[PDB]
Amino acid sequence: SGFRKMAFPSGKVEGCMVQVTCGTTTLNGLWLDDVVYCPRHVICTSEDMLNPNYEDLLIRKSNHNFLVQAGNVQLRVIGHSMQNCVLKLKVDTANPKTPKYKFVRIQPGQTFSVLACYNGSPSGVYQCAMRPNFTIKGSFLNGSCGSVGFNIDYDCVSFCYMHHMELPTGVHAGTDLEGNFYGPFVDRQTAQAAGTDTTITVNVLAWLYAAVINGDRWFLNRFTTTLNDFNLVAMKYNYEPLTQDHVDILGPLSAQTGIAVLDMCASLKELLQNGMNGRTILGSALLEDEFTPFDVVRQCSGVT
């Protein structure tokens, strides 16, 4: 029992982290096979970031201008190319610690672990979610760029995020491993404001199921609702609309607890309308939305 914001074990990803320096800029790179992936803004100075023309800036760079260091050893760069907002640096050595891996582009509401790095060295690991406004609420300082987000399925690492920037609002934006940003963000130091950060309803419901499984049941009420009635309330509280796909995904949690999905929706509706009244659920005074239904099943079953 007990329910924690748990990240995947980071060892497989730690073995991929390298330092990439170009000119005066140093950030993190991801070394998989004989390619090092990193944010293309490694070629920029702080001035260049105001209005960068990446193609023009990249013309002035050669393979020997990209310094890649894996631990205390230097890797030889034998090629470089720009794919969207990432640079792919071909090195002459395949990473001996390359795990089985995939590059995936996640949807909003999906969770992943982040291995925060500086100078190619890991500092910490934490769990987060891709927000519905395509930002992440991370913990990143200067030099954290190129730190990655990932999920693990047994021995396969699915890389889904690469850190690129912090918006003026303190929230984070980045790309998938093909270099395409999540959301409308661009790698420029310009006014970029995020849209509404709505709550991931299906995740809140999964976490309510995790609470019941772990014994916190005070919020269970004698009511039920319909998808349309629930969604009227969810719109009012800036919650994402719940669909039949979401109800389907909550099926195993509904079966495990014997609480119909729409009954849990009615409990969530009353929590939104009445508040917590100074009470807590799984040690939280607010409704947690960074656990997917898959995360709840995984944590509650012990998948290694």
Q: What are the residues binding ligand OWX (CB under 6 A)?
A: 1, 41, 49, 140-142, 144-145, 164-166, 187-189
209: Cβ contacts below 8 Å, ≥ 6 apart = 250, 253, 254, 256, 257, 259, 264, 293, 296
CB of 10 or CB of 175, closer to a copy of itself: 10
Of the residues 133, 284, 294, 297, which one makes contact with a copy of itself according to CB under 8 A: 284
Nearest-approach distance from CB 214 to a copy of itself, in angstroms: 7
Helices within 42-129 (DSSP H only): 54-59
Q: Which of 104, 163, 157 is nearest to 136 (CA)?
A: 163
- Report d(CA 32, CA 227) in Å as an integer: 44
- Please tell me whether residue 96 binds a copy of itself under the rule CB under 8 A: no
Of the residues 52, 143, 174, 293, which one makes contact with a copy of itself according to CB under 8 A: 143
- Report d(CA 18, CA 40) in Å as an integer: 15
Q: What is the DSSP string of 84-104?
A: TTEEEEEESS--TT--EEEE-
Of the residues 5, 61, 90, 188, which one makes contact with a copy of itself according to CB under 8 A: 5
Beta bridge partners of residue 107, listed in sequence order: none
Residue 41 falls in the annotated catalytic set? yes
- Please tell me whether residue 9 binds a copy of itself under the rule CB under 8 A: yes
Residue 80 falls in the annotated catalytic set? no
- Please tell me whether residue 7 binds a copy of itself under the rule CB under 8 A: yes
57: Cβ contacts below 8 Å, ≥ 6 apart = 43, 44, 48
Nearest-approach distance from CB 161 to ligand OWX, in angstroms: 13
Of the residues 215, 228, 244, 245, which one makes contact with a copy of itself according to CB under 8 A: 215
Query: How does DSSP classify residue 216?
Result: -
Nearest-approach distance from CB 209 to a copy of itself, in angstroms: 15
Work out what residue 118 binds among ligand OWX, a copy of itself, none; the CB cut-off runs from 5 to 8 Å by kind.
a copy of itself
- Report d(CA 110, CA 203) in Å as an integer: 9
Beta bridge partners of residue 220, listed in sequence order: none
Instruction: Report how far apart, in Å, the C-alpha atoms of 55 and of each of 58, 60, 64, 87, 173 are.
Output: 5, 9, 18, 11, 21
Nearest-approach distance from CB 170 to ligand OWX, in angstroms: 9
Tokens of residue 283, six digits:
């040690």
CB of 162 or CB of 247, closer to ligand OWX: 162
Tokens of residue 256, six digits:
């495990």
Nearest-approach distance from CB 267 to ligand OWX, in angstroms: 25
- Please tell me whether residue 128 binds a copy of itself under the rule CB under 8 A: yes
- Report d(CA 167, CA 180) in Å as an integer: 17
Nearest-approach distance from CB 224 to a copy of itself, in angstroms: 27
Work out what residue 82 binds among ligand OWX, a copy of itself, none; the CB cut-off runs from 5 to 8 Å by kind.
none
- Please tell me whether residue 273 binds a copy of itself under the rule CB under 8 A: no
Instruction: Report how far apart, in Å, the C-alpha atoms of 103 and of each of 32, 56, 100, 159, 297 are.
Output: 11, 28, 11, 5, 24
Marked catalytic residue, from 38, 41, 85, 128: 41
Stretch that binds a copy of itself, among 44-52, 62-70, 100-108, 292-300 (CB under 8 A): 292-300
Instruction: State the residues that interact with a copy of itself by CB under 8 A.
Output: 1-12, 14-15, 115-119, 121-126, 128, 137-141, 143-144, 166, 170-172, 214-215, 275-276, 278, 280, 283-286, 298-304
Q: Cite the active site residues.
A: 41, 145
